[PDB]
């Protein structure tokens, strides 16, 4: 409503309401696998130019 | 208007305490409860100490002197600067001095608000009972103590 003028004595005042809304968000977990060299076995593939096969 | 004592020609004497309250500046009620509902509204005219009605016409609705089937409440106080009137809704009872039509009002008489918001002797529309005789303050101003307690 319109604002209430405050003068002399008054008990009945205009009011302010409230409201809300809800939003839902989804999340997904994903994974990948990859092959590599064992740590202890790199020295049998360590070359001067590179490490690997 | 509301305070006719600001044009006084001489100082008043404040020794006596009897017959000192029947005046036009006695705003409010004789007995007031803390749980009395008070509503402030814009007004057009001079609705002080009279029954009022709502007028809808662009501006918000306002109140003005009235009665009968259009009675909404009773004006008991006015702020002149803001041009705002304090109103007791007709759903809430009231005891106090209100403007009467003439001086023919006596104790125990049932009263009705007329089209000007003044109380006159009498079906009826509201319950209003005179507690005193009509008392003259100005040449055309009569106040009567009335208990207004709802609608018939």
Q: φ, ψ for residue B146 (rounded to 5)? A: -140, 140
* Cα gap B143→B145, rounded to integer Å: 7
Neighboring chain B residues of A7 at a CB cutoff of 8 Å: 40, 79, 81-82, 84
Residue pair B44/B56 in contact by the 8 Å Cβ criterion: no
Neighboring chain B residues of A8 at a CB cutoff of 8 Å: 40, 77-79, 84, 86
Experimental method: cryo-EM
The partner residue sitting opposite A7, judged by closest CB among B36, B60, B84, is B84
Residue B25 C-alpha from the chain's centroid: 11
Residue pair B118/B66 in contact by the 8 Å Cβ criterion: no
Residue pair B109/B132 in contact by the 8 Å Cβ criterion: no
* Cα gap B100→A49, rounded to integer Å: 116
Rg (alpha carbons) of chain B, rounded to whole number: 16
Alpha-carbon dihedral sign for residues B15, B19, B22, B27: positive
Resolution in A: 2.7
Residue pair B141/B118 in contact by the 8 Å Cβ criterion: no
- Look at the block and give the residue holding tokens 């005219």: B45
Q: φ, ψ for residue B75 (rounded to 5)? A: -85, 125
* Cα gap B28→A45, rounded to integer Å: 103
Cβ distance A4 to B82 less than 8 Å, yes or no, reads no
The half-sphere exposure of B111 on its side-chain side, counting CA atoms within 13 A, is: 34
Residue pair B38/B92 in contact by the 8 Å Cβ criterion: no
Cβ distance A12 to B84 less than 8 Å, yes or no, reads no
Residue pair B66/B99 in contact by the 8 Å Cβ criterion: no
Residue pair B134/B103 in contact by the 8 Å Cβ criterion: yes
Q: How open is the CA angle B146-B147-B152, to the nearest 5 degrees?
A: 115
Cβ distance B82 to A11 less than 8 Å, yes or no, reads no
DSSP H or E segment with residue B150: strand B141-151
């Amino acid at each position: 409503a319109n604002p209430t003028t405050i003068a002399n004595e008054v008990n009945t005042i205009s009011t302010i309401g409230f409201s809300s809304e809800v939003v839902r968000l989804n999340y997904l977990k994903l994974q990948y696998k990859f092959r590599h060299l064992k740590q202890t076995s790199e020295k049998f593939y360590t070359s001067d130019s590179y490490i690997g096969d | 208007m509301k305070n006719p004592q600001h044009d006084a020609s001489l100082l008043s004497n404040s020794n006596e305490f009897r017959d000192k309250n029947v005046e036009f500046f006695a705003s409010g009620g004789t007995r007031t409860s803390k749980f009395d509902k008070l509503e402030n509204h814009p007004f057009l005219g001079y609705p002080y100490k009279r029954g009022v009605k709502r007028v809808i016409q662009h501006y918000e609705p306002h109140v003005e002197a009235g009665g009968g089937e259009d009675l909404y409440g009773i004006c008991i106080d006015i702020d002149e600067f803001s041009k705002t009137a304090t109103i007791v809704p007709i759903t809430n009872n009231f005891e106090g001095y209100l403007v009467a039509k003439d001086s023919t009002v006596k104790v125990k008489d049932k009263l009705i608000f007329n089209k000007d918001g003044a109380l006159e002797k009498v079906k009826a529309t509201i319950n209003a009972t005179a507690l005193t005789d009509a008392k003259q303050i100005s040449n055309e101003v009569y106040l009567v103590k009335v208990a207004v307690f709802g609608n018939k």
